[PDB]
Design a protein around this ligand. Structure first.
Ligand code: ATP
Ligand code: ATP
Ligand code: ATP
Ligand code: ATP
Ligand code: ATP
Lengths: 578, 367, 379
């Protein structure tokens, strides 16, 4: 016990052990197991950061504090450091000698307890290529006799995969399931731990601060367990607050500080609205309405969803917005989503759902099951969302994927989570889910037969209802049906395209001006409501880019100047210049 | 009783060691039991307590507050899921039978197939059950198991393959929390080859993963929610009389699940549509949730009862359940409140009031 | 990188688990973040508490060297942790931290760099900075959950365009000293923009530096008669187009003629069907002049008409005339709704997964090419 163990009672007497809060049932069970006649070896198992090592050390702490029944008093606990014990055992027989010496000391003490943290680690000490006498076997006979008392601690996965694989050693230990506390219990734990962190960071935590920290760690941090992530938020906020006094921004830990820390850890936006981010959303609809003309209700819906999300009163565990932009070709379905991603400065996750035409392509989205070739890769959707938890998810032409794939988005839209082949839950609570399609358009482009022409306005909705399952359509935030582009919209669009062309020219040191009658003639030539705004860019191309490209690639416009376009009236052609 | 309980409750250790462990731990406990000097003989009740402590199962707790929890469980759930009383009753009675000892010998606490139309409290009542009982909810979105070979994810990869050390999701989740509520959401979307696991899980209450471990389902409330035939339930039949398509959806259930599967289901509870009073209660629940959200920001809210009637009439749609009510509450309140709260009068202060005007069918607001 | 360093310093001041784990994509500069924190420490441009601490970069090979005779590695590591414990002013930096998940004996895969630091990191006596990529972090690191919970993950995203420009301007002195060349600021901005535009398979803060270093190395090779000159937009553009396969500036060289007489040269080989040649040549000329679509192919053409009138002939002659590899895909092999699996590849877990796609790999290997789909109505 000289240089291989650490006397936990000595460390508790110098205040090196944090105070154990609650855990009365588990401690009682550990004491009951410890007072058994044989095989009196408790094994604490549970998830990571639930308090197993905490309980084992708090046992010695309470022993020093005297808050123990009059059977475990005077029993000093030693924690075993496997590395220190295995350090110098270079020669054969040496490790066994020192381990047997330690076991003799413990057995002759008849009173001490050996707490082997990470007890799954002692299944290998041997080197002579086999199942040698190594520490696992070197302690097997003693536990079956109850001469020494050993406490272990190992996570559920480690215990299930490594420890219990050795049946003989496993049956000698009593499993004690350390479940993660509740919200109230972890609140009490943080309350009891407050003096240490307050002395360390020289800050004070309000009760509301602790409550908000626990609640937000429960809500947002979903990859850690309670009594370890709540104190994580608390210690992080304390460390952040202690870095302020150098700038003399010293105060207590208020709820807003905890919220900022949590937003940082979860990589989500919480209260940045207090800064110049309210204006960002305030003119968001305006900033989009100057990039995508017509289709205003879509901008209204997107802006209002994002506003409800940022203000706080959004959905609890659902995506920020799940919309189905349906409408004819070239009306701005993809474009509004791309410009939305650009406006918020938020990452765009693009998924062209025409590559998912086969039912078995779902393995691309969520990964391949264990035992199959692509297992180490993981799903594309889930990994993308895990990397970018705050992003815009765009599913182009979702009607082109196999109809069975929408059942994946079922749980994404309803519960906001998606589990890939490793058990990781992709968090969709900060994702603006947009799916575009032209599903019900073909039925509206129908010529009726008879003397009376009938209104086909409801055919688009009928087809959409016949394509997407009712339980899928039932969880969409809105189905924004897009309308065709009108004449004035075509004017604004040709202006946008001319501005883009002018930027493309300015890249080459050239300038352009187009007369108003020339703009109107461009709008008149290639306008086609059945094709949206793509044929307008096509007409701009074949009318201006081709002659301009000939002038640019050959002579005249190399480092050219102000190119002027004007419309004729005798023939309705376009003029050009230098 | 110790030998019998160690036989039929402790299935990871062998016989002349688990009986001995029960006896030894009971003796040690009765030795520590003199917190009032009270040492007595070890009776059957103490043995049952030690065993329920070891095997991680609910014991005889009629002398506990658990008696009161199970007592008002139906009424407490009925205040969170309005309508659908028969499902809450079946769930509560199954849980009670399992607690009183008159459970099944080697079957899960319950294996219910929650079917019905969309938007009704199908997957919701299960979450509320897990919350009220305070037991861990094991949720499994079965729509990710469309491929026939995803069973390898449920029970792990066989020996000799890459995903061996990961294990199975379902088996490990059960082994961690033996007393839990298993929610197999959207069960009809999984490949039919996945139901064959639930076959033995429901008939024998056990499941063996790849590492040879036995997953014990004897305390798990297995609940599967489906939408089989929902496309039929929403269809208006041809004829002068519109038919009830419930029995059609039941025939679809029969055409999806094999008879040996439907044979061991404890009940197939066909949820029904929401009525108008149910919709009013749903609106009230949503308004309470919204008020909690607002009070999280220091903003109060009250809505005139006539305005709640207006919201209910605006959003009511029986063919779509209670989800459109959330959308209507959103469109009518959350957007104006959000515009007031981000950049408006509502920053850092609330006391918002809402009422309906009869001539214009609008709502009022303000500080 | 003010916020990343600020969060790292906030983590390093925690009472427990004060171990920042810098995880980001490959080439973002996490190693650069750590080494730059050290460099700031040596310059005093750090918060007060973060002064007077020296960062040790731990290399696994040097530690794992020669450690036979079971116990040697455990002794080495315990001595290292001991020397590190007595400092309270030392920070250990492990560059590829996903590689410390095993150093134990193969007999029993056991106590190693991981199971030896867990009690030290959880007890908060030593401080470690880590670095790993997402692919390794989510596959190797966060499998020992007890080890992952001891590290505070810090997302290191790739900088913006102008942030990258400022990084290039800060790093310019050393590259200029190495290559003995000068870079104009306009050339630096052009380098960053072109790296954003064309170099698609590498991340931002690294591909611009790559363009800079290659331009400097090449400009040190131009002086065959000692023609040392400063790197301008032109040379850097050529270096970028080396990967992009088409320079935007160099068209004024002996290539303006090729686009000038492309139509007449093709009409010398494909007689009749003049307007098809006109359209192809005009599209290529637009894309070369710079009026092309910033997110679309050079062209997307549908050739219709009776058979054997030169639909494939004009295309093969175009591929020959432009010196461009013709990618031919016969849509007669794709008459089934399940053949696209050979176009894009099979999903993970299926027999043809690691084989990859035909069309995708072809386009990736030949960025500048002609794509030909014969009998598109047959597919
Ligand atoms: N019962 C408790 N009361 C108060 N605080 C606690 C309790 N348990 C844990 N903690 C705190 O949570 C932190 C982590 O929990 P704990 O150390 O008990 O689990 P662990 O041994 O680290 O598990 P693992 O090693 O598998 O990750 C501890 O540093 C401790 O401060
Ligand atoms: N309402 C609009 N106002 C201005 N420009 C527009 C509008 N719609 C489209 N455009 C332009 O036309 C092009 C196509 O836009 P977009 O792809 O978003 O339409 P779409 O709805 O997605 O068509 P599809 O049905 O094929 O998906 C874009 O370059 C865009 O700039
Ligand atoms: N009977 C009800 N009383 C009150 N609220 C309800 C009821 N049903 C549903 N809700 C609410 O409407 C939402 C949807 O409920 P739920 O998820 O349980 O229906 P579902 O059957 O699972 O839908 P689906 O068949 O599409 O999977 C929930 O947020 C829930 O709160
Ligand atoms: N914030 C920065 N400031 C200055 N220079 C930088 C910055 N980031 C990166 N660099 C430079 O760009 C290059 C790439 O960065 P770095 O080498 O630090 O990342 P990395 O170690 O390769 O990350 P990984 O290990 O995941 O691949 C480096 O040469 C570095 O000098
Ligand atoms: N306008 C032309 N100029 C030169 N050669 C030509 C022309 N038309 C046809 N040919 C000759 O016909 C031969 C085959 O032509 P090609 O392969 O292009 O068929 P196609 O036009 O693509 O029609 P399809 O493949 O559907 O049968 C060429 O080798 C070519 O010599």
């Amino acid at each position: 016990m000289e240089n291989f163990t650490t006397n936990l009672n000595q460390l508790a007497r110098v205040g090196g052990i944090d105070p154990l809060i609650g855990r009365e049932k588990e401690l009682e069970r550990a004491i009951q197991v410890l007072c058994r006649r044989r095989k009196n070896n408790p094994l604490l198992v549970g998830e990571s950061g639930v308090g197993k090592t905490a309980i084992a050390e708090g046992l010695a702490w309470r022993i020093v504090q005297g808050d123990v029944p009059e059977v475990m008093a005077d029993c000093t606990i030693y924690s075993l450091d496997i590395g220190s014990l295995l350090a110098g055992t270079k020669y054969r027989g040496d490790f066994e000698k020192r381990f047997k010496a330690l076991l003799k000391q413990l057995e002759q003490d008849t009173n001490s307890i050996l707490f082997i943290d990470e007890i799954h680690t002692i299944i290998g000490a041997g080197a002579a290529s086999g199942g040698q006498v190594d520490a696992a076997n070197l302690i097997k006979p003693l536990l079956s006799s109850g001469k020494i008392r050993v406490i272990g601690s190992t996570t559920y996965q480690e215990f299930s995969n490594i420890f219990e694989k050795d049946r003989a050693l496993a049956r000698r230990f009593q499993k004690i399931d350390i479940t993660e506390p509740s919200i109230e219990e972890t609140v009490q734990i943080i309350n009891g731990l407050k003096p240490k962190y307050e002395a360390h960071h020289d800050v004070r935590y309000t009760a509301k601060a602790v409550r908000a920290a626990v609640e937000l760690a429960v809500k947002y941090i979903n990859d850690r367990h309670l009594p370890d992530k709540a104190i994580d938020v608390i210690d992080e906020a304390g460390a952040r607050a202690r870095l302020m006094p150098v700038s003399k921004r010293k105060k207590t830990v208020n709820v807003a500080d905890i919220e900022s820390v949590v937003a940082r850890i979860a990589r989500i936006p919480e209260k940045s609205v207090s800064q110049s981010d309210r204006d960002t959303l305030k003119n968001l609809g305006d900033r989009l309405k100057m990039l995508v003309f017509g289709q205003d209700k879509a901008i209204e819906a997107l802006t209002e969803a994002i506003k409800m999300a940022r203000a706080g009163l959004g959905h609890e565990h659902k995506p920020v917005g799940s919309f189905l932009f349906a409408g004819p070709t070239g009306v701005g379905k993809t474009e509004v989503t791309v410009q939305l991603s650009k406006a918020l400065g938020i990452e765009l996750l693009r998924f062209d759902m025409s590559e998912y035409m086969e039912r078995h392509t779902v393995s691309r989205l969520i990964g391949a099951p264990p035992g199959y070739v692509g297992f180490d890769q993981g799903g594309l959707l889930t990994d993308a969302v895990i990397k970018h938890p705050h992003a815009v998810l765009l599913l182009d032409e979702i009607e082109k994927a196999h109809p069975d794939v929408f059942n994946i988005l079922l749980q994404v839209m309803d519960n906001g989570t998606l589990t890939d082949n490793n058990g990781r839950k992709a968090d969709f609570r900060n994702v603006v889910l947009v799916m575009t399609t032209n599903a019900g358009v073909r039925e509206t482009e129908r010529k009726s037969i008879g003397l009376i022409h009938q209104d086909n306005s409801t055919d688009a909705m009928e087809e959409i209802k016949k394509i997407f399952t009712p339980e899928f359509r039932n969880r969409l935030d809105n189905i924004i049906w897009f309308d065709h582009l009108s004449t004035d919209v075509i004017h604004q669009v040709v202006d946008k395209f001319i501005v883009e062309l002018q930027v493309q020219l300015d890249q080459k040191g050239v300038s352009l001006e187009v007369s108003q009658e020339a703009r109107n003639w461009l709008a008149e030539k290639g306008y086609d409501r059945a094709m949206g705004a793509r044929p307008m860019a096509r007409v701009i191309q074949d009318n201006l880019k081709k002659p301009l490209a000939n002038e640019l690639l050959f002579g005249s416009l190399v480092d050219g100047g102000q190119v002027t376009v004007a419309l004729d009236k005798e023939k309705n052609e376009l003029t050009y210049g230098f």
